[PDB]
Amino acid sequence: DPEKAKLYQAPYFEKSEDEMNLITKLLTHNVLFSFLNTKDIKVVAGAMQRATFKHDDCIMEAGQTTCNKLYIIQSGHADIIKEGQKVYLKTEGTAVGELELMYDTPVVATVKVCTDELIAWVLDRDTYRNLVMGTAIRRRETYIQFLANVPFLGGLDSYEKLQLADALSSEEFSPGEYIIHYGEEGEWLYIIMEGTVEVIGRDADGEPTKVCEFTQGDHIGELEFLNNHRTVADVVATTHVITAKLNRRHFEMCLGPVIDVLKRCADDPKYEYYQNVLKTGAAQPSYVD
Ligand SMILES: O=c1[nH]cnc2c1ncn2[C@@H]1O[C@H](CO)[C@@H](O)[C@H]1O
Ligand SMILES: O=c1[nH]cnc2c1ncn2[C@@H]1O[C@H](CO)[C@@H](O)[C@H]1O
């Protein structure tokens, strides 16, 4: 199969440089494209066509077999409706139609525009299957059972956990290896699948100081993403460690629903060090790419 996709030539619809930039930004922040390289992202963007909708339009309707398209929303929102009940809200940058393309099933839920207008970029099934889907199902299988047992993700439903899985890769560390170094940009969030880590801050004299430990099910790296600064501690493996790793460019999409659970670092006594870093102004800015 992978050898056959090599022979597939995606369609191209003329794009200005500004349109390519716009679409590429949507794709590089949407989890469905997480592991495509830069050349492939550009081919996929070139294959997309613009579509627009009005309030109350159905982009697709439950039961349809005639869609078979992937829509990435530029702007506007849409309700996901099952059995007449609104169950999810799709917003800018998100995709609709991916469930049907990934799992080869008729449309599962109605997608109904709920803003005045919606603008989307649309990809055909063949380009999705040949260039995008890749190992999506295997990747979901690698992580889903684990994610279902991670405390800070307990509020996400299955759909949201699978969306997070789409953006995860694995990295292992031997004892004494640094997962995060102090003073770095801060673009990786790690969820500990196995092992123990130590958080090493800097004290008032600038010397390393042990802050706390984390272990299986804990996360590190989110503080820089929440508060837009460079890293303020090292994180060092104290045992062999296995992590699932999420890039900052996917954080808003995958973990949006828990952005608040994560702000509760303020209350945790384990984050006294960090709160003092923020209070004293000891970190410089860093924003998502
Ligand atoms: O449970 C869900 N949560 C969020 N979105 C969903 C869910 N089921 C479907 N969709 C979305 O609606 C489209 C049409 O079925 C799917 O492709 C997916 O984007
Ligand atoms: O005070 C703290 N308590 C617990 N973890 C911390 C604290 N400060 C930093 N980190 C952790 O180290 C990473 C890099 O700065 C942060 O993202 C967070 O996971």
Numbering used by the authors: 213 to 501
What does the paper say about this structure?
Cyclic nucleotide binding domains (CNB) confer allosteric regulation by cAMP or cGMP to many signaling proteins, including PKA and PKG. PKA of phylogenetically distant Trypanosoma is the first exception as it is cyclic nucleotide-independent and responsive to nucleoside analogues. Here, we show that natural nucleosides inosine, guanosine and adenosine are nanomolar affinity CNB ligands and activators of PKA orthologs of the important tropical pathogens Trypanosoma brucei, Trypanosoma cruzi, and Leishmania. Substitution of two to three amino acids in the binding sites is sufficient for conversion of CNB domains from nucleoside to cyclic nucleotide specificity.
To evaluate the binding mode, we solved the crystal structures of T. cruzi PKAR(200-503) and T. brucei PKAR(199-499) bound to inosine at 1.4 Å and 2.1 Å resolution, respectively. The structures of TbPKAR and TcPKAR show high overall similarity. Residues that contribute to high affinity binding by interacting with the ribose moiety of inosine are identical in both structures and reside in a segment that we denoted ribose binding cassette (RBC), in analogy to the phosphate binding cassette (PBC) nomenclature for mammalian PKA. Residues G309; E310; E312 and A321 belong to Ribose Binding Cassette A (RBC-A), while G433; E434 and E436 are part of Ribose Binding Cassette B (RBC-B). Capping residues (Y371 and Y483) taking part in a π-stacking interaction with the hypoxanthine ring of inosine are marked with an asterisk. In the ligand-bound structures of TbPKAR and TcPKAR, this helix docks to theβ-barrel of the B-site, covers the binding pocket and shields the ligand from solvent. The high-resolution crystal structures of T. brucei PKAR and T. cruzi PKAR thus provides a molecular rationale for absence of binding and activation by cAMP.
